[PDB]
Design a protein around this ligand. Structure first.
Ligand code: NGA
Ligand code: NAG
Ligand code: NAG
Ligand code: NAG
Ligand code: NGA
Ligand code: NGA
Ligand code: CA
Ligand code: CA
Ligand code: CA
Ligand code: CA
Ligand code: CA
Ligand code: CA
Ligand code: CA
Ligand code: CA
Lengths: 135, 416, 76, 84
């Protein structure tokens, strides 16, 4: 804040408050960031031990131990990196499909833009994108 | 050989000479007016300028040295180096199991620190008991233990078939099956930078050190049920811990803040300084009459007499990446000790003084009303691939079926 | 529980062979909280703290042959 | 022609013996501490983590890791009849 660094050179890490989480660099971040699939603390220590922890009442938990907002469960999009938010929920149409024919459906029960079939990355977490029988 | 009695100062009693520290190398036997001393099974006695030695049967001992990117072997008999494992990074700790499968290859367990966003690991490899080098390349297996940050303390239990480890940034002590299937947290509270861990299966006890704001050395039951602090005063940075099983189950530790090596009994009742000006010691190991320790600032291995007697010698100069020294020999850990467990436990059986107890992996719990069965799924053992076993300098290649197969030197023949 | 088994205070029963075998099976340890001694010859005396046997005359001869007790002033 | 390594700027640079043409050959050189040149190739040492790296002396292409040798490593020299 002042160009001689006199405001920071002598400083000791501050104690974290009731809704904060602490990182081995002695940093404080919001608890919500913990296990959110992003390395908010550079050592990825905010994503540690996630499988044994429970989740916030507003958030769904993925098989990988990670939390995602519950409104994004069963929405057709893979919000969990493991697609466990979509893998599990009930049938969506009398057709028995999980995805409209305007789009593409993959065994992860994930629904994907049709043009994505067979281009570079597997847009379906593992459900047979880029397979030659699609290409 | 006799001292006056306190009950009657006009009478004479026999001193237990075996109660003196450093009286003999391995074992002492009291006699009324005298003492006798002997080496235990597997050891022999030999004359030397300083008296009787105890020297061990079997192929001569070796030293295992983990650098940051390689694990390397040194042979005290031949005074030479051999190449075991390479192309790794951030290795920290080592421990070995001598004959887990009867074949002539030991198994080695080593820990890897987190590099960044990527987490650490515990890894598993085969170590030939016989002479070998880069002719027998080593494959690696990973136990799959997720979320490790700084697993700077590792121990292996050969009776219960378990692996124990300490992580300074999770602030926990954890036990798992020796292939990584079931995982349990034994000590979760009042830890600050746990640094080193050792196990005694005969006593059913585990020992560990803390290096943080309040340095302490602690002992517990291998199932975690009982906990105690053996030393708290004058401990600085206690960074390495070793156990002597022949000199009455005794504990040694190294401190780099005070440049000292100290010894206590497993109950804390007798404390001694063995080596001062130890040059910032970072790891310890003990074999026969000798104590080996590593110096961190300048990469050296030093040896002295474990009772503090005499003088200290410099055995090796190995670069500053050196983190530990381990002694590799059949008689370091008593392979004969028998497991108390009786196959009642569904997931884990853990040792305690005089017996065993059953444990469930983390997050699971015992089925209602049971003490031996858990609400968790069974995991099948993870057996690792066959290693390159070519003995007499032969060289190994992986065939189209990926099986290792050997080619001999002109002087030898055979499948391996 | 029954049919000739042995029972623990935890509400748990084990085979009778396990009862006194040098391994605490009950978490309450009551399987081996008491078992009879196995003794030496009539001319000798036994100490359990070290699993040792000594001639009976040693039991009171002004030497602490058994470290935790069962020798000298206690027996004298 | 003259080449030098700078560890404060993590760079390897080249000039002519009169100073009349200056170029950067290798950036993000990882705190380089010693240099040597042979044939089409330039070899340099990385001080923080004990590594030997090689690249094309004109900066072309990509850089390769040739060795991992512990942090005590101070220099790399090339030994051959036709170096001098
Ligand atoms: C009272 C008692 O414990 N007696 C034992 C006896 O049962 C038997 O074991 C004997 C063998 O010589 O030793 C003594
Ligand atoms: C069934 O599927 C087709 C194509 O996706 C769609 O046109 C139709 O609206 C669906 N009908 C019902 C009842 O879901
Ligand atoms: C160590 O060296 C001795 C010779 O001094 C040799 O007999 C022995 O086989 C060596 N050990 C190993 C494991 O190579
Ligand atoms: C090893 O353990 C066995 C079984 O308890 C014991 O009989 C033997 O004396 C031990 N050997 C040594 C050298 O400690
Ligand atoms: C796990 O999260 C839940 C909310 O879903 C509760 O906050 C619960 O208290 C948490 N676990 C523990 C042990 O408190
Ligand atoms: C789920 O889908 C199937 C097949 O389309 C049936 O339509 C079924 O009725 C659906 N489930 C429910 C509860 O309506
Ligand atoms: Ca996060
Ligand atoms: Ca975020
Ligand atoms: Ca979703
Ligand atoms: Ca896309
Ligand atoms: Ca695609
Ligand atoms: Ca005596
Ligand atoms: Ca029993
Ligand atoms: Ca006596």
């Amino acid at each position: 804040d002042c160009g001689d660094n006199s405001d920071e050179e002598s400083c000791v890490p501050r104690e974290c408050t009731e809704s904060e989480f602490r990182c081995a660099d002695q940093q404080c971040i919001p608890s919500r960031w913990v296990c959110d699939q992003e390395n908010d603390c550079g050592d990825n220590s905010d994503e540690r031990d996630c499988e044994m922890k429970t989740c916030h009442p507003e958030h769904f938990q993925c098989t990988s131990g990670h939390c995602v907002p519950k409104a994004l469960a069963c929405d057709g999009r893979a919000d969990c990196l493991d697609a466990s938010d979509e893998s599990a929920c009930p049938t969506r149409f009398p057709n028995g499909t999980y995805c409209p024919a305007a789009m593409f459906e993959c065994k992860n029960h994930v629904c994907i833009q049709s043009f994505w079939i067979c281009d570079g990355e597997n847009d379906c977490v593992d459900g047979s994108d880029e397979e030659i029988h699609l290409c | 050989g006799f001292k006056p009695s306190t009950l009657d100062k006009n009478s004479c009693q026999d001193i237990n000479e075996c109660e003196e520290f450093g009286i003999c190398p391995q074992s002492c036997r009291n006699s009324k007016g005298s003492y006798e001393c002997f080496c235990v099974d597997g050891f022999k006695s030999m004359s030397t300028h300083y008296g009787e030695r105890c020297a061990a049967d079997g192929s001569p001992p070796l030293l295992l040295l983990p650098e940051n990117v390689r694990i390397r072997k040194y042979n005290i008999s031949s005074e030479k180096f051999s190449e075991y494992l390479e192309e790794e990074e951030h290795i920290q700790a080592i421990d070995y199991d001598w004959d887990p499968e009867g074949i002539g290859l030991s198994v080695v367990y080593y820990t890897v620190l987190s590099q960044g966003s990527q987490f650490g690991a515990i890894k598993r490899a085969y170590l030939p008991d016989f002479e070998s080098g880069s002719n027998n390349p080593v494959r690696e297996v990973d136990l799959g233990l997720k979320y490790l940050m700084q697993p700077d303390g590792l121990a292996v239990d050969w009776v219960g078939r378990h692996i124990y480890w300490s992580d300074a940034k999770s602030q926990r002590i954890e036990v798992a099956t020796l292939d990584g299937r079931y995982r349990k947290w034994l000590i979760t509270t009042q830890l600050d930078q746990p640094a080193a861990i050792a196990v005694n299966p005969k006593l059913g006890l585990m020992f560990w050190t803390d290096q943080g704001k309040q340095p302490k050395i602690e002992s517990a039951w291998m199932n975690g049920e009982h906990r105690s602090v053996l030393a708290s005063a004058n401990l600085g940075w206690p960074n390495g811990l070793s156990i002597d099983y022949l000199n009455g189950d005794r504990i040694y530790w190294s401190d780099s803040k005070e440049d000292v090596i100290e010894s206590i009994k497993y109950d804390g009742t007798d404390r001694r300084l063995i080596i001062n000006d130890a040059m910032k010691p970072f790891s310890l190991d003990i074999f026969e009459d000798q104590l080996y320790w590593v110096a961190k600032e300048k990469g050296e291995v030093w040896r002295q007499n474990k009772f503090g007697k005499g003088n200290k010698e410099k055995l090796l100069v190995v670069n500053p990446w050196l983190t530990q020294v381990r002694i590799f020999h059949q008689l370091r850990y008593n392979q004969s000790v028998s497991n108390p467990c009786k196959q009642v436990c569904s997931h884990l059986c853990l040792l305690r003084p005089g017996g065993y107890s059953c444990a469930c992996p983390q997050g699971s719990d015992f089925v209602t009303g049971s003490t031996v069965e858990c609400d968790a799924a069974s995991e099948l053992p993870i057996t690792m691939p066959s290693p390159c076993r070519c003995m007499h300098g032969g060289s190994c290649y992986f065939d189209e079926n990926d099986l290792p197969k050997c080619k001999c030197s002109s002087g030898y023949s055979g499948e391996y | 529980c029954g049919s000739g088994n042995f029972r623990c205070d935890n509400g748990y029963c084990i085979p009778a062979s396990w009862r006194c075998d040098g391994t605490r099976d009950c978490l309450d340890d009551t399987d081996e909280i008491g078992c009879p001694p196995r003794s030496c010859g009539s001319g000798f005396f036994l100490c359990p703290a070290e699993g040792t046997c000594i001639p009976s005359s040693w039991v009171c001869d002004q030497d602490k042959d058994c470290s935790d007790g069962a020798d000298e002033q206690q027996n004298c």
